[PDB]
């Protein structure tokens, strides 16, 4: 019955610079009590969520003075005066004022950083996987920034599509960099037939697209 | 020292039942309203249910109004959630949570609802590339297991630097697959030994795979 809309959807920030998020509600959250039951939360990667600000502006215990909570009526704001690498994660707003209890869809805070290019590695299928009857060819991009990147698979210079899938790490604690895998699935039968398997990587931190490959023998 | 511990989660078949419980320390259980909140994989937080300090009021989410029951035993300082007619979209991490302000959160327990069999993974070595950027890379491909989760360590937790264990991905087959990899010095290959330790609690399979360069 009562809808919470967060802005922006994603927010990358240079550490030390300020940050700002808004949460907008469908119906006024002011109540007869004189307290507005709107709260802010952080979920750090891999972790359970945790309370930051409660009842609009009050800082919960454990929580740095950097974090501020603000606003009234339909419109509310969370601020981080000086952003740290501690602050990476997803921030949600919520109300406990009337049933059903509703959360925002969340705002992912990312750390802005100097551009850095990926080291790239490529792995043939194991003999054990081939003995199974499947083949998968893995291409690793290590320690790079920013996230956006085109990894493209070639078998004897035939561009591939719909047969590769990627996963990405959470950006590193020390490094603030991402890493990424792309995994190409093919049949044993087809893998045996072809010679040269190639992972073409395009990235902002590369002057032009780069390639890592192998031939099945050695 | 506030603590909330959840139990009960695991793999269920659709239209099947599963009983979640949450035990508590560090504050007066019976002074506090409690809630459950869930998070579907890769999605936001979704509130499920709420129960008053003395069990006089209960509230539920629209999605679970028909099939979910929230109950508690203040004598045993425990909160419960009985989930009866389980669908695929109920699959989530279920968090036990304090009702005032949602201030204290349990670690969560994973509930998975589907008709797929529990299957153990196969672990294949991603043997280190011959060229030297002086960095080599190597890894472990953990393929064709269900359900989540799997954990990967290297040399029984002794090797941690350089390691990227990826988020799993759901293959077309409807099985999860995953790679964990580590970058090392090229010269270190002959002198150091690399074993990946893969534990899959649901299937109760644990495999240690030695990774070495191709013959
Ligand atoms: Zn072919
Ligand atoms: Zn009620
Ligand atoms: Zn790395």
CATH number of domain containing B144: 2.60.40.10
In terms of domains, do B124 and B212 share one? Answer: yes
Cα of B36 from ligand 2 centre, angstroms = 15
In terms of domains, do B100 and B4 share one? Answer: yes
Q: Are strands A67-72 and A75-80 parallel, antiparallel or unpaired?
A: antiparallel
In terms of domains, do A167 and A65 share one? Answer: no
User: Structural domain tally of chain A?
Assistant: 2
**Alpha-carbon gap, residue B135 to A21, rounded angstroms:** 41
In terms of domains, do A164 and A200 share one? Answer: yes
| Contact between B37 and B45 (Cβ < 8 Å) | yes
| Contact between B111 and B91 (Cβ < 8 Å) | yes
Q: Record the resolution, in angstroms.
A: 2.2
In terms of domains, do A174 and A104 share one? Answer: no
| Contact between B186 and B135 (Cβ < 8 Å) | yes
In terms of domains, do A20 and A102 share one? Answer: yes
Domain boundary among A88, A112, A136: A112
Tell me the residue range of the domain where B163 lies.
Answer: 116-215
Which numbered ligand comes closest to the C-alpha of B57?
A: 2
Distances, alpha carbon A72 to alpha carbons A22, A29, A35, A68, A137, in Å: 12, 8, 10, 14, 54
Distance of CA A169 to the CA centre of its chain: 8
In terms of domains, do A120 and A166 share one? Answer: yes
CB pairs A-B closer than 8 Å? 127
The phi, psi pair for A120, rounded to 5°, reads -125, 130
Distance of CA B98 to the CA centre of its chain: 21
**Alpha-carbon gap, residue A93 to A51, rounded angstroms:** 10
Domain boundary among B52, B85, B115: B115
Query: Rg of the Cα trace of chain A?
Result: 23
Domain boundary among A112, A128, A152: A112
In terms of domains, do A98 and A152 share one? Answer: no
Cα of B148 from ligand 2 centre, angstroms = 36
Which numbered ligand comes closest to the C-alpha of B163?
A: 3
Task: Supply B207's token pair.
Answer: 């495999």
Per-residue exposure over A156-178, b if at least 16 CB sit within 10 Å of its own CB, e if not: eeeeeeeebeebebebeeeebbb
**Alpha-carbon gap, residue A42 to A57, rounded angstroms:** 15
In terms of domains, do B148 and B50 share one? Answer: no
In terms of domains, do A21 and A88 share one? Answer: yes
In terms of domains, do B110 and B32 share one? Answer: yes
Per-residue exposure over B46-85, b if at least 16 CB sit within 10 Å of its own CB, e if not: bbbbbbebeeeeebbbeebeebbebebeeeeebbbbebee
**Alpha-carbon gap, residue A132 to B157, rounded angstroms:** 29
3-state secondary structure of B191: helix
Domain boundary among A63, A82, A112: A112
In terms of domains, do B92 and B142 share one? Answer: no
| Contact between A141 and A192 (Cβ < 8 Å) | no
Q: Which residues of A touch B108 (CB under 8 A)?
A: 48
In terms of domains, do B9 and B98 share one? Answer: yes
Domain boundary among B78, B99, B115: B115
In terms of domains, do A29 and A54 share one? Answer: yes
Q: Are strands B11-12 and B109-113 parallel, antiparallel or unpaired?
A: parallel
Cα of B213 from ligand 1 centre, angstroms = 26
3-state secondary structure of A193: helix
In terms of domains, do A69 and A146 share one? Answer: no
Of A54, A140, A179, the CB nearest to B103: A54
Tell me the residue range of the domain where A128 lies.
Answer: 113-216
Which position has the token pair 């561009």? A159
| Contact between A83 and A17 (Cβ < 8 Å) | yes
User: Structural domain tally of chain B?
Assistant: 2
Domain boundary among B58, B87, B115: B115
* Cβ <8 Å between B179 and A106: no
Q: Which residues of A touch B167 (CB under 8 A)?
A: 167-169
Q: Are strands B135-145 and B18-25 parallel, antiparallel or unpaired?
A: unpaired
In terms of domains, do B37 and B124 share one? Answer: no
Return the closest-CA partner of residue A101 out of B49, B40, B103: B49
In terms of domains, do B92 and B120 share one? Answer: no
In terms of domains, do B135 and B107 share one? Answer: no
């Amino acid at each position: 019955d009562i809808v919470m809309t967060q802005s922006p959807l994603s927010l990358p920030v240079t550490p030390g610079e300020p940050a700002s998020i808004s949460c907008r509600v469908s119906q006024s959250l002011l109540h007869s009590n004189g307290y507005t039951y709107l709260h802010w939360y952080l979920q750090k990667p891999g972790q359970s969520p945790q309370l930051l600000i409660y009842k609009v502006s009050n800082r919960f215990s454990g929580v740095p003075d950097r974090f501020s909570g603000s606003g009234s009526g339909t419109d509310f704001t969370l601020k981080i005066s000086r952003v740290e690498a501690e602050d990476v994660g997803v921030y949600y707003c919520s109300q406990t004022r009337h049933v059903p209890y509703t959360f925002g869809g969340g705002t992912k805070v990312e750390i802005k950083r100097t551009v850095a290019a990926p080291s790239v590695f490529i792995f043939p299928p194991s003999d054990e996987q081939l003995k199974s009857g499947t083949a998968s060819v893995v291409c690793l991009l290590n320690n790079f920034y920013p996230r956006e990147a085109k990894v493209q698979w070639k078998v004897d210079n035939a561009l591939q599509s719909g047969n590769s899938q990627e996963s990405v790490t959470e950006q590193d604690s020390k490094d603030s960099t991402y890493s990424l895998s792309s995994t190409l699935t093919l049949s044993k039968a087809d893998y045996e037939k072809h010679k040269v398997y190639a992972c073409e990587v395009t990235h902002q931190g590369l002057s032009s697209p780069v390639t890592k490959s192998f031939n099945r023998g050695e | 020292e506030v603590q909330l511990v959840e139990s009960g989660g695991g793999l269920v078949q659709p239209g099947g039942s599963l009983r979640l419980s949450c035990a508590v320390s560090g504050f007066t259980f019976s002074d506090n309203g409690m809630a459950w909140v869930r998070q579907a994989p890769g999605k936001g937080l979704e509130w499920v249910s709420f129960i008053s300090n003395l069990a006089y009021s209960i509230d539920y989410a629209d999605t679970v109004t028909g099939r979910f029951t929230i109950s508690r035993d203040n004598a045993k300082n425990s909160l419960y959630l009985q989930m009866n007619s389980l669908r695929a979209e109920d699959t989530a991490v279920y968090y036990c949570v304090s009702g005032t302000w949602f201030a204290y959160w349990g670690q969560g327990t994973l509930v998975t609802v589907s008709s797929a069999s529990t299957k153990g993974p196969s672990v294949f070595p991603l043997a280190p590339s011959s060229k030297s950027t002086g960095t080599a890379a190597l890894g472990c491909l953990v393929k064709d297991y269900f359900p989540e989760p799997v954990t990967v360590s290297w040399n029984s937790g002794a090797l941690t630097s350089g390691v990227h264990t990826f988020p799993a991905v759901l293959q077309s087959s409807g099985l999860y697959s995953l790679s964990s990899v580590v970058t090392v010095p090229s010269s270190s290959l002959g002198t150091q030994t690399y074993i990946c330790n893969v534990n899959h609690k649901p299937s109760n399979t644990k495999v240690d795979k030695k990774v070495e360069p191709k013959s």
